Amino acid sequence: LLEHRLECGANDMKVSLGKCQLKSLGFDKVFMYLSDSRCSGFNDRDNRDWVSVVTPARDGPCGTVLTRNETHATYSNTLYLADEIIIRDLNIKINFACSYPLDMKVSLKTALQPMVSALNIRVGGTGMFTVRMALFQTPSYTQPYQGSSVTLSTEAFLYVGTMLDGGDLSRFALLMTNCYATPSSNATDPLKYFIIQDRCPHTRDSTIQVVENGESSQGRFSVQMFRFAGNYDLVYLHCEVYLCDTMNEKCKPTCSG
Amino acid sequence: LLEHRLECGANDMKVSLGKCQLKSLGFDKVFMYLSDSRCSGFNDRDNRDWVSVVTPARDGPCGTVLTRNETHATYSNTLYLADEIIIRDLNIKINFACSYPLDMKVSLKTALQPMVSALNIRVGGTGMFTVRMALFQTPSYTQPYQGSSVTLSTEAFLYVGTMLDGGDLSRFALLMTNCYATPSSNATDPLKYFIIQDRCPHTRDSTIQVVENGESSQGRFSVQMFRFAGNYDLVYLHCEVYLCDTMNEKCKPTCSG
Amino acid sequence: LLEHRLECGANDMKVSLGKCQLKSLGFDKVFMYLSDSRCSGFNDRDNRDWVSVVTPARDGPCGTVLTRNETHATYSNTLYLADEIIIRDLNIKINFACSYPLDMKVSLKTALQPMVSALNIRVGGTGMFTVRMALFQTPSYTQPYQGSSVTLSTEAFLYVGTMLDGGDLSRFALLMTNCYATPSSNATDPLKYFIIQDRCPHTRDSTIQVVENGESSQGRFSVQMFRFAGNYDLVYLHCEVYLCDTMNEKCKPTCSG
Amino acid sequence: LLEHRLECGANDMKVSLGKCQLKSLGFDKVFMYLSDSRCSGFNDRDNRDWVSVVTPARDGPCGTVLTRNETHATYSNTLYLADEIIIRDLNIKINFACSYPLDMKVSLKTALQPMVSALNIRVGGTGMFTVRMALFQTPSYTQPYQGSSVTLSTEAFLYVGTMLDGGDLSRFALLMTNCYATPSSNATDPLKYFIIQDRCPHTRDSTIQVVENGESSQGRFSVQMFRFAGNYDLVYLHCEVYLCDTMNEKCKPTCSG
Numbered sequence A, B, C, D: 001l002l003e004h005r006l007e008c009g010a011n012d013m014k015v016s017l018g019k020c021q022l023k024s025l026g027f028d029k030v031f032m033y034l035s036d037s038r039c040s041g042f043n044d045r046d047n048r049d050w051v052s053v054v055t056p057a058r059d060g061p062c063g064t065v066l067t068r069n070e071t072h073a074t075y076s077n078t079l080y081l082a083d084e085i086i087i088r089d090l091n092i093k094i095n096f097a098c099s100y101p102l103d104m105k106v107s108l109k110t111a112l113q114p115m116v117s118a119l120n121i122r123v124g125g126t127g128m129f130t131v132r133m134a135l136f137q138t139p140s141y142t143q144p145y146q147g148s149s150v151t152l153s154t155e156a157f158l159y160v161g162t163m164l165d166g167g168d169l170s171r172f173a174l175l176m177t178n179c180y181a182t183p184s185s186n187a188t189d190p191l192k193y194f195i196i197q198d199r200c201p202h203t204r205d206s207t208i209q210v211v212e213n214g215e216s217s218q219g220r221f222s223v224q225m226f227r228f229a230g231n232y233d234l235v236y237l238h239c240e241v242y243l244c245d246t247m248n249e250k251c252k253p254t255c256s257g
Ligand SMILES: *[C@@H]1O[C@H](CO)[C@@H](O[C@@H]2O[C@H](CO)[C@@H](O[C@@H]3O[C@H](CO[C@H]4O[C@H](CO[C@H]5O[C@H](CO)[C@@H](O)[C@H](O)[C@@H]5O)[C@@H](O)[C@H](O)[C@@H]4O)[C@@H](O)[C@H](O[C@H]4O[C@H](CO[C@H]5O[C@H](CO)[C@@H](O)[C@H](O)[C@@H]5O)[C@@H](O)[C@H](O)[C@@H]4O)[C@@H]3O)[C@H](O)[C@H]2NC(C)=O)[C@H](O)[C@H]1NC(C)=O
Pocket: A069, A070, A071, A072, A074, A099
């Protein structure tokens, strides 16, 4: 028939009923007692007109009894409800209880910042990233060629490329900047024929075609095979590469005039 | 206080300290952390007992930072050194870094051998090497005589020689094999008096003496002058020479009996 | 397809091709190498625009090889022909060689003129040329008569002549200048009858006729026989002759008035 | 130093030296040349071992030169003397020449004997030789007596003789054979007194004496004068004479008993 506002703070229990009792149960005048009848109710106004009692959550200050469990401390008492000093039709009692946990967690809000003497040691060094080169037997760059020598007719079409195996593959593209054939295993020699001379292919010779350079970890290009004029019989391939920053630079070169 | 083993490969950085920390710093138990504290150290055994961490040379996989220059990519992180979960006397930190060049050079190891159609043209011919002869005015073979005729008494002593001027002087010695006087400018005539007849001088006549033949580019010999008996008045000198292989033959002849 | 100019001197070999290669083989630009590729060609102009190389005829200065025979020293090398640093359709090579004889003949050009003391001996003497005379039995002067005496009637016709047997027959004609009969074997005697008196016959007597005198080696004439008047019985014939220069004189006399 | 044998025939000149050159000039071996050096010497043996050359007496067959004069044809050449093919101490030359006359005399040796018709005329006659007689006035027969008559006393002594004047005085002596006195001029008369009767005087008469008869051209005798007895007065003398062959006869008579 009635609403029930129960609040429990750390120090005291409060219990109240509203102005619903102005009509409900016919309570023209309202009495409210706890088990110690010296503790009577009053009329609060902070939120609404409320009829209420207040009892400390202690053993016995208004007769309240404390039940003790492993998980909680429980306090209990009873409101007695009446419209008169004496009653004759219905003994109305509101039995109420509330509990508190005994297990809780806490923390300091101040952060502590320590300071300490310190020793600073430095060391340092260097290393390199593996790059390799390969010649292919097949159009689609697919197939390995291991042999320490390959013989070809001059009508044959080499396919070739370079690969970045080492690491940091998202940051560095493999960019060829210079690539050339020599008649010697020493890569420094006075006679060079150029396929890629300055970040661009030597497209003046129509038999050179480039597939991919600077966009990935594996560069690809192709050219018809040839023989050095003069008293020569072997062809060696040498090139120069550069690890190109994929974040702070355009790595794909423009080859034009 | 401590040694430092730093290795950098193409994929990962490794950093280690040895069992020197078994006594040094009192590290009964050893902790080792990088800037991402989820990456902790371990105990390696491939060479010695080493305490070490391993981090890929990438952006951030254990908090490692990459600094970028024009000449190098540099990676850096820090070891934290401790004997306990918590510390109180010295914050020990090892700051380390290593770098990699961005400019590198590469090569193919396979040699390429081309084949090609060929055209073969031959030509050929012949030539000769200049040899000359001279008469001298003086003992030491020194002096020229240009004149188109020389008059001498019969008490006079001619000095004469031949010279190889043409070329290939290290391979061919000038060897006289035959030399004779005629009463005529035609060198073929029926009357001959011999100075050198068959690779040797006609030493039967005591007035002939040879200096050098077959050892050099200039041969030398001498003989008292004479007149052809009969109705004759002029003397002409003619000889035959041979270019002698200094490598595959003894060129100095032996004149004996 | 091409001409070939090969010259070999005593010191160096020269080899060249002309401007035929301006169109031939499409050689827009011309490369020319020997087996040592450091020796390259050049553009000569002394006769025409020629493309050429020059190599000393030695062992190895541009890789040239020397083959040695008994008769010759032979040098050989190869031109490599190309229109580009590198080639792809035809390896064009010109193989060339030239040789030199090892056996040669030489001479001094100065003539030598000796002088010598001399001894001069003279001797000298004299001699004579045989001439003979004959009487003939027959008209055509043909027949010999040996007999130490011949008897004739006075109606008989002697035929007579003289002959030059001795020598120098082209230079000397036999010329009779005087001829006469005596009554004695002494040829000097006071009585003479003349047939030929002074380079001419005594034609006043009609019985004398001359055939040939001064034109040949055998003179001929005839006269009817006769007897000396008086106490005489024998006839002897005597004559005088002269050897006439056939080169510096007319030998045929003119007999007239 | 050397002898020189020079002979010249009608056809050829010969010139030689002997074995004196075996020691002289040291000519161990002997060379001998003329001006045409193709004509060399040889070793003759017909008389001795001689070294010699032979050249026809013509223009140029071994280079010999002919000089022509009015009196002679002269030929000249030179020997060259040597002990070797070539010489050095003395050029030895023998200059020689010989000549032939151009004027010569010749004869036929056959004698010619003519025969001829002949005419024979004879004539003939006779003559006489003058003899005379004389009377003398004086003892020595000396004096003439011309007178046509002489008177004498009878004591007188006539002297008388005869003379042969005519001729042939060497062949004929005048021989008186008969002589007598007559008393008459007719010499035939019957009375004769004889002085010489028969080749002898009538010496019985002591007054007759004969001087010379038959030995010469003049006979002589004498007798005392006398007169014929009887009638007579004149005395005449007559005699008979005979021409006596002085070659085939004794002409002096012997008068005896
Ligand atoms: C130690 O001691 C402590 C302190 O006593 C014990 O902790 C307490 O345990 C109690 C028992 O579980 C909790 O009580 C409540 O029990 C109700 C069940 O019984 C009542 O309801 C039945 C109705 O359900 C029945 O339906 C039919 C019949 O109708 C049956 O056939 C059927 O079988 C059902 O049982 C009645 O029949 C019965 O007679 C009882 O009257 C639960 O319903 C109740 O659940 C409530 O949970 C919360 C409580 O409010 C809090 O949360 C809300 C969240 O929105 C918040 O708004 C509030 O302000 C509160 O903070 C609400 O959702 C409802 O009110 C539910 O009804 C309870 O379970 C005590 O709550 C509990 N005390 C606590 C936790 O502080 C502890 O168990 C002991 N330890 C031991 C024994 O080891």
